[PDB]
Scaffold this active site. Structure first.
Site, PDB file in Angstrom:
ATOM      1  N   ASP A 194       0.837  -1.191   0.000  1.00  0.00           N
ATOM      2  CA  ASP A 194       0.000   0.000   0.000  1.00  0.00           C
ATOM      3  C   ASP A 194       0.880   1.251   0.000  1.00  0.00           C
ATOM      4  OD1 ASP A 194       1.013   0.309   2.599  1.00  0.00           O
ATOM      5  OD2 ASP A 194      -0.967   0.120   3.571  1.00  0.00           O
ATOM      6  N   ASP A 196       1.208   4.727   2.517  1.00  0.00           N
ATOM      7  CA  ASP A 196       0.838   5.317   3.797  1.00  0.00           C
ATOM      8  C   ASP A 196       1.202   6.804   3.836  1.00  0.00           C
ATOM      9  OD1 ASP A 196       0.241   2.603   5.077  1.00  0.00           O
ATOM     10  OD2 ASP A 196       2.381   2.400   4.504  1.00  0.00           O
ATOM     11  N   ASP A 257      -3.560   4.372   2.785  1.00  0.00           N
ATOM     12  CA  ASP A 257      -4.009   4.779   4.113  1.00  0.00           C
ATOM     13  C   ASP A 257      -3.689   6.247   4.297  1.00  0.00           C
ATOM     14  OD1 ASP A 257      -4.886   2.222   4.903  1.00  0.00           O
ATOM     15  OD2 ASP A 257      -2.904   1.631   5.534  1.00  0.00           O
TER      16      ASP A 257
HETATM   17  N1  LIG Z   1       0.750  -4.507  13.201  1.00  0.00           N
HETATM   18  C1  LIG Z   1       1.318  -3.345  12.799  1.00  0.00           C
HETATM   19  C2  LIG Z   1       0.930  -2.761  11.594  1.00  0.00           C
HETATM   20  C3  LIG Z   1       1.518  -1.565  11.186  1.00  0.00           C
HETATM   21  N2  LIG Z   1       2.461  -0.969  11.948  1.00  0.00           N
HETATM   22  C4  LIG Z   1       3.107   0.294  11.548  1.00  0.00           C
HETATM   23  C5  LIG Z   1       4.511  -0.010  11.041  1.00  0.00           C
HETATM   24  C6  LIG Z   1       4.359   0.001   9.538  1.00  0.00           C
HETATM   25  O1  LIG Z   1       5.567   0.364   8.864  1.00  0.00           O
HETATM   26  C7  LIG Z   1       3.268   1.045   9.334  1.00  0.00           C
HETATM   27  C8  LIG Z   1       2.501   0.882   8.037  1.00  0.00           C
HETATM   28  O2  LIG Z   1       1.915  -0.415   7.966  1.00  0.00           O
HETATM   29  P1  LIG Z   1       2.069  -1.290   6.622  1.00  0.00           P
HETATM   30  O3  LIG Z   1       1.331  -2.581   6.837  1.00  0.00           O
HETATM   31  O4  LIG Z   1       1.702  -0.395   5.446  1.00  0.00           O
HETATM   32  O5  LIG Z   1       3.635  -1.646   6.638  1.00  0.00           O
HETATM   33  P2  LIG Z   1       4.805  -1.195   5.617  1.00  0.00           P
HETATM   34  O6  LIG Z   1       4.399   0.075   4.918  1.00  0.00           O
HETATM   35  O7  LIG Z   1       6.042  -1.209   6.473  1.00  0.00           O
HETATM   36  O8  LIG Z   1       4.954  -2.419   4.574  1.00  0.00           O
HETATM   37  P3  LIG Z   1       4.359  -2.547   3.073  1.00  0.00           P
HETATM   38  O9  LIG Z   1       5.499  -2.251   2.145  1.00  0.00           O
HETATM   39  O10 LIG Z   1       3.921  -3.988   2.984  1.00  0.00           O
HETATM   40  O11 LIG Z   1       3.183  -1.605   2.985  1.00  0.00           O
HETATM   41  O12 LIG Z   1       2.417   0.985  10.488  1.00  0.00           O
HETATM   42  C9  LIG Z   1       2.838  -1.591  13.176  1.00  0.00           C
HETATM   43  O13 LIG Z   1       3.708  -1.085  13.905  1.00  0.00           O
HETATM   44  N3  LIG Z   1       2.262  -2.754  13.569  1.00  0.00           N
HETATM   45 MN   LIG Z   2       2.611   0.383   3.835  1.00  0.00          MN
HETATM   46 MN   LIG Z   3      -0.873   0.930   5.544  1.00  0.00          MN
END
Ligand SMILES: Nc1ccn([C@H]2C[C@H](O)[C@@H](COP(=O)(O)OP(=O)(O)OP(=O)(O)O)O2)c(=O)n1
Ligand SMILES: [Mn+2]
Ligand SMILES: [Mn+2]
Length: 333
Positions: A194, A196, A257
């Site tokens: 996604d 963010d 998001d």
């Molecule tokens: N259970 C979770 C879910 C999310 N986050 C925080 C850390 C992530 O970096 C951020 C954004 O969530 P994402 O699922 O979008 O994670 P990423 O952006 O790091 O990975 P991707 O490349 O898959 O979107 O919110 C967290 O601490 N714990």
């Molecule tokens: Mn993300």
């Molecule tokens: Mn996200």
């Protein structure tokens, strides 16, 4: 020597042990699917150690002195080094339970509890889910509608296009409001699941009512396929979206998001939302266990003194916790 907490060491985006870390993370994921949170965390920590190493692990003798490398994780690496394959990992990959749980949990709006319930009730395929729409939330329905696009990695080029339309909508709704790219892309990732974005305004309270105006503008431009707005409950105002991203000759659904934070909480929100998930888990555990403070995406609280730390930046927060600052690209734990 390498410190035990992921927040005490730089973890770069690219590293020398991707085969080994991928194998451990398959086992971590599978543990999570079975509600084995201890085993998930153990495998995740071992994988993150490998990501921090300056060289490839070619022989098992290189595991000596590394934290978070108990018997099970060491055996996995051993088999890979000696045979090119780990039987336990292969068995997990081929298992219907793992494949189905991966399939379901990847869907927008589906967590482990929902996926497991569906598994237990005999559902296996995406078609199975579409045959039982009464079992799906509106979010999950949207996820299924767009599942091909949403399974396609989001690229930096997509992020740049999306950031432009979000910045345009924010700027037209409220001059002075800002948009900050967070998540994995802020950490330097070339792809993701996604995009963010964190939204604020330098005058506390001027961000009130901003997100609905931003969404109206984007919706009017044909850019929104799905939108779920939620006011702060407990706990930031946010919009869980699927955008329709135009491409040369076609278009692509992309999860976005949008999170609004008041500027007083922005550094905590930026830190929390930048991740990685493991980095932040480790950062929160460190704060609690080593410094007796509770860190979350809103603040840093001393539960004995009943006080909150006023941070102007992420650097402030690191300093307050006695940690050397790590820029986002070194938070890839
Ligand atoms: N259970 C979770 C879910 C999310 N986050 C925080 C850390 C992530 O970096 C951020 C954004 O969530 P994402 O699922 O979008 O994670 P990423 O952006 O790091 O990975 P991707 O490349 O898959 O979107 O919110 C967290 O601490 N714990
Ligand atoms: Mn993300
Ligand atoms: Mn996200």
């Amino acid at each position: 020597w390498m410190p035990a907490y992921a927040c005490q060491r730089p973890t770069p985006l690219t590293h020398h042990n991707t085969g080994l870390s991928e194998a451990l993370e398959i086992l971590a994921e599978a543990a999570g699917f079975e509600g084995s949170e201890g085993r998930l965390l153990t495998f995740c920590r071992a994988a993150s150690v490998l990501k921090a190493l300056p060289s490839p692990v070619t022989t098992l003798s290189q595991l000596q002195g590394l934290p978070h490398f108990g018997e099970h994780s060491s055996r996995v690496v051993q088999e890979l080094l000696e045979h090119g394959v780990c039987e336990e990992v292969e068995r997990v990959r081929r298992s219907e339970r793992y494949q189905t749980m991966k399939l379901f949990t990847q869907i927008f709006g589906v967590g482990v509890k929902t996926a497991d319930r569906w598994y237990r009730e005999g559902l296996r395929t995406l078609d199975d889910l579409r045959e039982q729409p009464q079992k799906l939330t509106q979010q999950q329905k949207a996820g299924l509608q767009h599942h091909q696009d949403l399974s396609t990695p989001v690229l930096r080029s997509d992020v740049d296009a999306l950031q432009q339309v979000v910045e345009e909508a924010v700027g037209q709704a409220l001059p002075g409001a800002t948009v900050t790219l967070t998540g994995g892309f802020r950490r330097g990732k070339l792809q993701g699941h996604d995009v963010d974005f964190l939204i604020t305004h330098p005058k506390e309270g001027q961000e009130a009512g901003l997100l609905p105006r931003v969404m109206c503008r984007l919706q009017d431009q044909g850019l929104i396929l799905y939108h779920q707005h939620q006011h702060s409950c407990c706990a930031f105002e946010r919009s869980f979206c699927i955008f329709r991203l135009p491409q040369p000759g076609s278009w692509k659904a992309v999860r976005v998001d949008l999170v609004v934070a008041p500027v007083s909480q922005f550094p905590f929100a930026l830190l929390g939302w930048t991740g990685s998930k493991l980095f932040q888990r480790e950062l929160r555990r460190f704060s609690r266990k080593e410094k007796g403070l509770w860190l979350n995406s809103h603040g840093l609280f001393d539960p004995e003194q009943k006080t909150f730390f006023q941070a102007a930046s992420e650097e402030d927060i690191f300093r307050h916790l006695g940690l050397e600052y790590l820029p986002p690209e070194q938070r890839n734990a």
